[PDB]
């Protein structure tokens, strides 16, 4: 179930996949959960998204050491907001190679984040240029277009039914898309549908701010984004 480890929560989603959850008090919204992923690929571990803070991200690494006990080969972060990139310095202090969309790295300083060490770039069709994501194993990285932010990226896990929409996708019963100050209102709806079409076999949709949901999360998020 939900394994409490300090102030974080870990949930196993598949034999080699876990969801990490961390919380930040956001004045006005309560204590906001943010989810990322941990994937074991043979003898190494891959991380998708930091926690909100360096201290929480160090706790993710401590949980990995206790429950998996294999080296963390790399982390990929899915856009330049605090819930996804707030713990970059903890990854760097641990010697972990970090990757983000080139545009996320460009935006990181003005968003108050530390950039990742390596920049991903994407083909016209949205799939990562393979030379920019070396040794990613089962992680399949896709840029669906601007939506929640201009830089948001998404990740499928080969060998599982899981795809990660990050903060682009909301659950089946969300009422709004949240803060939209950085959003691309013209393109959001198409980007959400593009994520669904890039991972057509994924039946478990993991996202930043809700528990894992069915593909109705994608259709509902798209159906909601159609209106704007
Ligand atoms: C700090 C994050 C970066 S995505 C944020 O802005 N949030 C957290 C989730 C609830 C609100 C929403 O957008 O749904 C606002
Ligand atoms: Zn965000
Ligand atoms: Zn978010």
From Swiss-Prot:
GO molecular function per UniProt: beta-lactamase activity; zinc ion binding
Binding-site positions, substrate: 170, 179
Domain of life: Bacteria
EC number assigned by the record: 3.5.2.6
Localisation per UniProt entry: Periplasm
Functional description taken from the UniProt entry: Confers resistance to the different beta-lactams antibiotics (penicillin, cephalosporin and carbapenem) via the hydrolysis of the beta-lactam ring. Does not confer resistance to the polymixin colistin or the fluoroquinolone ciprofloxacin.
Subunit architecture: Monomer.
Protein name (database record): Metallo-beta-lactamase type 2
Whole-protein residues included: 42 to 269 of 270
């Amino acid at each position: 179930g939900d394994q409490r480890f300090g102030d974080l929560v870990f949930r196993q989603l598949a034999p080699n996949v876990w969801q990490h959850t961390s919380y930040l008090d956001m004045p006005g919204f309560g204590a906001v959960a943010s989810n990322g992923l941990i994937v074991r690929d043979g003898g190494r571990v891959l991380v998708v998204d930091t926690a909100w803070t360096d201290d929480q991200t160090a706790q993710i690494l401590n949980w990995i050491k206790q429950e998996i006990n294999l080296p963390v080969a790399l982390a990929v972060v899915t856009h330049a907001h605090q819930d996804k990139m707030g713990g970059m310095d903890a990854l760097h202090a641990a010697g972990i190679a970090t990757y983000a969309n080139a545009l996320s790295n460009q935006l990181a300083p003005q968003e108050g984040m530390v950039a990742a060490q390596h920049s991903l770039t994407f083909a016209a069709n949205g799939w990562v240029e393979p030379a920019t994501a070396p040794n990613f194993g089962p992680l399949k990285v896709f840029y669906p277009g601007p939506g929640h932010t201009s830089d948001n990226i998404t990740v499928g896990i080969d060998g599982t039914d899981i795809a990660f929409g990050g903060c682009l996708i909301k659950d089946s019963k969300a009422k709004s898309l949240g803060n939209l100050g950085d959003a691309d209102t013209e393109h959001y709806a198409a980007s959400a549908r593009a994520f669904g079409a890039a991972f057509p076999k994924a039946s478990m949709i993991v996202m930043s701010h809700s528990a894992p949901d069915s593909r109705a999360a994608i259709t509902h998020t798209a159906r909601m984004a159609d209106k704007l």
